[PDB]
Write a protein that binds this ligand. Structure first.
Ligand SMILES: [Mg+2]
Ligand SMILES: [Mg+2]
Ligand SMILES: [Mg+2]
Ligand SMILES: [Mg+2]
Ligand SMILES: [Mg+2]
Ligand SMILES: [Mg+2]
Ligand SMILES: [Mg+2]
Ligand SMILES: [Mg+2]
Ligand SMILES: [Mg+2]
Ligand SMILES: [Mg+2]
Ligand SMILES: [Mg+2]
Ligand SMILES: [Mg+2]
Ligand SMILES: [Mg+2]
Ligand SMILES: [Mg+2]
Ligand SMILES: [Mg+2]
Ligand SMILES: [Mg+2]
Ligand SMILES: [Mg+2]
Ligand SMILES: [Mg+2]
Ligand SMILES: [Mg+2]
Ligand code: NA
Ligand code: NA
Lengths: 218, 129, 208, 142, 103, 33, 73, 84, 71
RNA sequence: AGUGUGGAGAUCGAAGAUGAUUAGAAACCAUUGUAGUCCACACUGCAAACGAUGACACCCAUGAAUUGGGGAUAUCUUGAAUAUCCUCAGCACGUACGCGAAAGCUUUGAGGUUACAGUCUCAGGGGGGAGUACG
RNA sequence: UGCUGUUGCUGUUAAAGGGUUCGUAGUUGAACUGUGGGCUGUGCAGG
């Protein structure tokens, strides 16, 4: 049973927040993973384990082995999240990484290569994400090319909802902890790029907590 | 020494836009710099700008709105036939939906879309988006 | 922020509160200055110290008071003081405006450790000196919380949004400015009136 | 400064934007040209002539009053230096350096500076030969 | 791996080329004068008890007239400075602390 | 300290060895010539 | 509380700048009246009337006992 | 405002806040971007229902230039007087 | 860093020609020393006559007698 | 450092001598000492010859300093110096973007680069063999 | 295989800036000669 501990969790439980778009718009952090389970419909948040590998810390008698788990979450329709957690046992790491992945969900802007008919199918502009030595570059592609990418970025992009994209990589891509995060940062950056379609000014609106301050007072 | 006035000006503009300034001083100026600025202005990427006369190569103060992501010069000014526009857009522009390659042509300095409409080639000056 | 939509000067400085600013030494500026506070300084005096012009000081005080008054729930505004000379002024401001408060050492994780109890999620933060209240300001920058600060001349203005140039060290100056902020905020509400001078006496606003 | 060394000094004149002579300057252009020629006839190069006119006679710029630069006036009157002024001064410096090095054969720093001065002399002589301000076969003799 | 931004010496990249060495006060090792550890020592000639005994026997020295001191500028090589504990290895964060006056 | 692990002996003495080797080879060939 | 305009700077900012760092460069020097002669403020060529001024590294020093008036432009 | 098909549908997932000071899009994970509500004052000192809200991008906060930007905003919006 | 001039083609051509020799594979492909030293003379296979059967000990940490022939 | 020819030859000191230490000690330590160390003239052209960071040019945040020259307007000696501010040029220091595998760098870039183009130039392409062999 | 790199590499510590200058082919090289004007209609032009 979920008993919220933050104001945003209380507003989500009270149903006065109906989408993740409202949280994204005001840049509010998500501290309880149940918010994402609530705001995304049943059976529409796909998860997957991306990589599990051991890490060792040397000790005066041998070494201590823990496990790092990387989890991807997404609705295949413009929302993606990456979680990475360490645990003494594999199952603990997997569960914690699923929760962390749900916590780190982000919007992905999708666009068109040429003519704008149908749903957006590709990224709206060239983007690059870097983590360590690994950099992943996403290039818009026409319809029908699919995801021309290595398997790990391919899986992440599939969970993000991108159908056609050219991809280039550099650095030590076998460092998969860095590759996953580099792809995530490339995707997260699609909504920060100012396009002529976003030149028109916006009316600033009050935050959910501002408008439901009295409700959260009780 | 300074070898390209246009490259210097466009690097200055890109630095000022990257650091969030609203005005930038350009020095020295030339006719080609003014035409490039006017091409950027025609598409709304910069605001109003003023040419200061010093009886020398002048100075320009450009008013920057937040629309300009990056502008830069292409050196050397490569030849571009009418069939090379797609290649340059693929190579140097963020997408086919926006952004411009600026060219100098015998019909004058213009962006790539207007040049393709006039069916003229020329030398590539730079880009902005 | 004395300008209003109607053009009235109801919120301008009445010269009946200015001599209080001059009286409690609210302009002496620690002989040190920062780039962000170059604007609020009028000049350098004898003995090598800076003075804060009172026009901009009062304008920012009005802006902060109006921002505080825009909050429907006074408990949504937390006011903090790591320095000991602000604790009593903090208590008095809170007990007269309804704002939350906390003095002394700031416990890290207060605004970010959700599951720890004593974890609070204020909407606005008011601090007495951004240098000494640095930890609260650092925590606020992780949770979308704007910061109002009483800033001296050498104030690091990193995550402060409304800086009030003042004297951050004198007991009398801190008490005077907090009393002024409380009075102005209560005047923006209907609780007191402009014509009648406030009954509250400011000597007990000082610490110990 | 920049040529031959790490000097990056910026000191120089800043000519005024308003080019018209001051109203209190009541010397006619022909008299200024006469002054320039008289100074040249007393063995003064254009730099020194301009400096005397600026210091003692209130003539900030000869070109702004007469419309002509000082070396142009000297050329029109047959008074221009046989070899250009800057080249003359560089050759004089090189000659003095060589005279000093005749006795001081271990002043290696002066030998270095002499190499720099002679390279400068050759680059300038090349320029002046190209613009026909020097004869062909003009030779710098050490 | 560069341990120090100054490379253990007071000689910035474009300040000067060569600084003439000096002999270590202790071992004689030649050390660039900028790099060496320099201390100026003002030392009493006798300790307090010897000073009292000598002042008791002196018409010159007493409460009115101080006894002379020793003055020495001592420059050490790094090994001798460390060994005599005039300077010690410090934690990485504390290595940047510089004292300009005697304390 | 002040250096990383060499492949064999101290490089300056290895260079001195190769120097003595070259001098000996030069002497040998000047003998045969 | 006023944003500076690069095209129209304040006199306080422009007064501080080096003569070639100004928005439009220009001289620091002037002419002065000291018969009455005209002397450059930065004369170095031993101006005479008796010497009227002494050359230095910057502005020449006018000799004591003679009156000096700065000229326009 | 945003992307559209040829059919006229708005296909952007959401329209992010564009800061009035920096003219940059506020990201979902900015977490230092803030919104400040500055109250409107009537003929007298009493506060009415309506309020003015302004957004500051998080990087502007991180660089210590947020107070300056809010000053210029309140000068532009008529909230705060430019001079005496 | 590299030269960029519009008429600087000769410098780039000479530079690439010189530096192509540093690639070990390219150098082996464009020289005769490997083909000369190669017992097969550049062929994929070669016929030979068995001289003797020999046993070659495997390298550490393995331990075996690898059966070979001298041909 | 080394080479040649003259000179010098106090000090220190490769070679060497003697005494210790040691299992041995051709070492470290002690006492010495040749060549050298110094000068003129002529060679040699190698250094962790280092900022292990090529040269020229542009932009670039903050505070306290420092060297030289200028500009404007409190103290001390009798012009010099000092004070406040500004300025050009120089060697740097502390705490912003941004960058980097990190250590770190940061108007003194290693920043302004996959959003990859100011100019010229040198070098590198797994470790050894080897800066060896041959010319 | 962006491990030959024009597109498109690396050179503080991983391989790699020449000890420092001078300098000839070579490469590269600052501005400037230049807003065409009137007339009617038409356009979320704008102050
Ligand atoms: Mg050292
Ligand atoms: Mg020097
Ligand atoms: Mg050296
Ligand atoms: Mg030292
Ligand atoms: Mg060690
Ligand atoms: Mg070490
Ligand atoms: Mg090494
Ligand atoms: Mg020798
Ligand atoms: Mg001797
Ligand atoms: Mg001896
Ligand atoms: Mg031993
Ligand atoms: Mg001995
Ligand atoms: Mg190799
Ligand atoms: Mg490589
Ligand atoms: Mg290197
Ligand atoms: Mg390196
Ligand atoms: Mg190396
Ligand atoms: Mg050499
Ligand atoms: Mg040269
Ligand atoms: Na085995
Ligand atoms: Na070094």
């Amino acid at each position: 049973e979920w008993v919220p501990c933050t104001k945003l969790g209380r507003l989500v439980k009270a149903q006065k927040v109906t989408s993740l778009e409202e949280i994204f718009l005001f840049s509010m952090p998500i501290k309880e993973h149940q918010i994402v389970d609530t705001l995304i419909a049943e059976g529409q948040l796909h998860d997957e384990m991306m990589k599990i590998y051991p890490v060792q810390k040397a000790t005066s008698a041998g070494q201590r082995t823990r496990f790092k788990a990387f989890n991807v979450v997404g609705d295949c329709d413009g929302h993606i999240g990456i979680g990475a957690r360490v645990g003494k046992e594999v199952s603990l790491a997997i569960r914690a990484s699923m929760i962390a992945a749900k916590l780190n969900i982000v919007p992905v802007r999708r666009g068109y290569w040429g003519n704008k008919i149908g749903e957006p199918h590709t990224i709206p502009m060239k983007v690059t994400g870097k983590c360590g030595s690994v950099a992943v570059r996403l290039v818009p592609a026409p319809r029908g090319t699919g995801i021309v990418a290595a398997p790990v970025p391919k899986k992440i992009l599939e969970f993000a909802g991108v159908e056609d994209v050219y991809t280039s990589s550099r650095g030590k891509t076998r460092t998969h902890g860095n590759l996953i995060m580099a792809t995530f940062y490339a995707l997260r950056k699609t909504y920060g790029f100012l396009t002529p379609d976003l030149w028109a000014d916006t009316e600033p609106s009050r935050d959910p907590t501002d408008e439901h301050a009295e409700l959260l007072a009780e | 020494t300074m070898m390209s006035v246009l490259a210097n000006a466009l690097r200055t503009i890109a630095s000022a836009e990257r650091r969030g300034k609203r005005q930038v001083l350009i020095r020295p100026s030339s006719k080609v710099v003014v035409k490039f600025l006017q091409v950027m202005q025609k598409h709304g990427y910069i605001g109003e700008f003023e040419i200061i006369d010093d009886h020398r190569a002048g100075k320009i103060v450009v008013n920057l709105n937040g629309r300009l992501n990056k502008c830069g010069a292409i050196c050397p000014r490569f030849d571009c036939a009418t069939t090379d526009y797609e290649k340059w857009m693929k190579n140097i522009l963020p997408s086919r939906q926006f952004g411009f390659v600026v060219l100098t042509t015998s019909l004058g300095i213009m962006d790539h879309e207007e040049a393709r409409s006039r069916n003229t080639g020329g030398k590539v000056l730079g880009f902005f988006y | 922020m004395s300008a209003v939509e109607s053009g009235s000067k109801v919120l301008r400085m009445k010269e009946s509160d200015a001599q209080k600013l001059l009286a409690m030494r609210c302009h002496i500026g620690t002989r040190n200055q920062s780039s962000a506070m170059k604007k609020y300084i009028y000049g350098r005096t004898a003995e090598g110290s800076h003075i804060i012009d009172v026009h901009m000081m009062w304008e920012k005080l009005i802006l902060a008071a109006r921002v505080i008054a825009a909050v429907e729930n006074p408990k949504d505004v937390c006011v903090c003081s790591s320095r000991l000379y602000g604790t009593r002024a903090i208590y008095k401001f809170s007990q007269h405006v309804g704002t939350s408060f906390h003095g002394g050492r700031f416990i890290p994780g207060t605004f970010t450790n959700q599951i720890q109890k004593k974890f609070v999620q204020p909407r606005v933060l008011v601090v007495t000196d951004p240098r000494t209240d640095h930890q609260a300001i650092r925590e606020a920058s992780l949770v979308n919380i704007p910061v109002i600060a009483l800033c001296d001349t050498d104030a690091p203005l990193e995550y402060v949004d409304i800086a009030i140039p003042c004297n951050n060290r004198g007991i009398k100056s801190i008490g005077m400015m907090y009393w002024l902020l409380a009075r102005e905020v209560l005047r923006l509400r209907g609780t007191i009136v402009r014509s009648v001078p406030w009954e509250e006496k400011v000597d007990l606003f000082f610490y110990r | 400064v920049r040529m031959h060394g790490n000097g990056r000094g910026k000191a120089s004149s800043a000519l005024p934007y308003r080019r018209t002579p001051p109203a209190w300057l009541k010397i006619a252009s022909r008299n200024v040209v006469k002054m320039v020629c008289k100074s040249s006839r007393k063995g003064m190069m254009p730099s020194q002539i301009g400096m005397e006119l600026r210091d003692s006679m209130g003539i900030a710029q000869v070109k702004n009053v007469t419309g002509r630069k000082i070396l142009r006036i000297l050329k029109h009157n047959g008074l221009a230096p046989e070899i250009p002024e800057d080249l003359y001064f560089l050759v004089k410096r090189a000659t003095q350096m060589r005279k000093h090095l005749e006795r001081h054969t271990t002043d290696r720093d002066t030998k270095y500076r002499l190499i720099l001065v002679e390279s400068r002399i050759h680059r300038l002589a090349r320029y002046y030969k190209r613009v026909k301000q020097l004869p062909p076969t003009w030779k710098y003799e050490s | 791996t560069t341990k120090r931004r100054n490379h253990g010496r007071s000689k910035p990249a474009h300040s000067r080329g060569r600084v003439k060495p000096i002999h270590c006060f202790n071992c004689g090792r030649l050390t660039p004068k900028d790099k060496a550890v320099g201390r100026f020592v003002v030392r009493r000639m006798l300790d307090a008890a010897s000073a009292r005994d000598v002042a008791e026997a002196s018409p010159v020295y007493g409460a009115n007239f101080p006894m002379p001191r020793l003055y020495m500028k001592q420059r050490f090589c790094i090994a001798c400075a460390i060994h005599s504990r005039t300077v010690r290895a410090r934690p990485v964060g504390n290595r940047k602390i510089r004292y300009t006056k005697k304390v | 300290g002040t250096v990383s692990r060499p492949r064999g002996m101290r490089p300056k003495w290895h260079k001195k060895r190769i120097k003595r080797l070259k001098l000996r080879r030069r002497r040998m060939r000047q003998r045969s010539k | 509380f006023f944003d500076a305009d690069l095209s129209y700077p304040t006199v306080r900012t422009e007064r501080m700048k080096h003569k070639r760092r100004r928005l439009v460069q220009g001289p620091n020097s002037y002419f002065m009246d000291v018969q009455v002669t005209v002397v450059y403020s930065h004369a170095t060529t031993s101006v005479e009337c008796k010497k009227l001024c002494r050359p230095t590294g910057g502005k020449a020093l006018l000799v004591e006992g003679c009156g000096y008036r700065r000229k326009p432009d | 405002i945003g992307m559209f098909n040829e059919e006229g549908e708005n296909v952007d997932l959401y329209i992010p806040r564009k800061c009035h000071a920096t003219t940059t899009l506020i990201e979902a994970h900015d977490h230092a971007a803030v919104q400040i509500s500055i109250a409107n004052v009537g003929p007298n000192g009493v506060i009415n229902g309506t309020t003015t809200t302004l957004c500051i991008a998080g990087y502007l906060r991180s660089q210590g230039e947020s107070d300056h930007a809010i000053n210029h905003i309140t000068i532009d919006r008529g909230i705060m007087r430019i001079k005496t | 860093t590299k030269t960029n001039g519009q008429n600087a083609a000769r410098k780039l051509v000479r530079l690439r020609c010189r530096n192509r020799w540093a690639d070990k594979g390219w150098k082996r492909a464009h020289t005769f020393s490997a083909r000369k030293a190669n017992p097969f003379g550049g062929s994929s296979h070669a016929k030979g006559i068995v001289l003797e059967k020999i046993g070659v000990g495997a390298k550490q940490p393995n331990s075996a007698i690898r059966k070979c022939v001298r041909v």
